Write a protein that binds this ligand. Structure first.
Ligand SMILES: NC(=O)c1ccc2nc(N)sc2c1
Length: 100
């Protein structure tokens, strides 16, 4: 569908900004201790892709909200001086601008 095509385009462009794949897959507690205790609504680019394919996004607004959730989670869990926090903040702002 038109929406699925646009969201696939946005997702490709957003993922290009995360070359290490820090946000490619759900965060594991092994990698990030206590993550599942701290973050109630996890999100990641892979989950977003699956939601596109399942036709679960009915508006760009819904997709943007999941992107923001992913970034907000990273800025809640990781301390500001970490690579993960800095990239989440950078890609949140740049990603919203790109989609506009
Ligand atoms: N999405 C995240 O918040 C995230 C991703 C990767 C990662 N690697 C760590 N050692 S902490 C951590 C957190």
């Amino acid at each position: 569908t038109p929406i699925q095509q646009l969201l696939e385009h946005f997702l490709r462009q957003l993922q290009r900004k995360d070359p290490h794949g820090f946000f490619a897959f759900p965060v594991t507690d092994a990698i990030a201790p206590g993550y599942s205790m701290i973050i109630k609504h996890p999100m990641d680019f892979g989950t977003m892709k699956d939601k596109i394919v399942a036709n679960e996004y009915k508006s760009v607004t819904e997709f943007k909200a999941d992107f923001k959730l992913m970034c907000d989670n990273a800025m809640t869990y990781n301390r500001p001086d970490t690579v993960y926090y800095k990239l989440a903040k950078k890609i949140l702002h740049a990603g919203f601008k790109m989609m506009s």
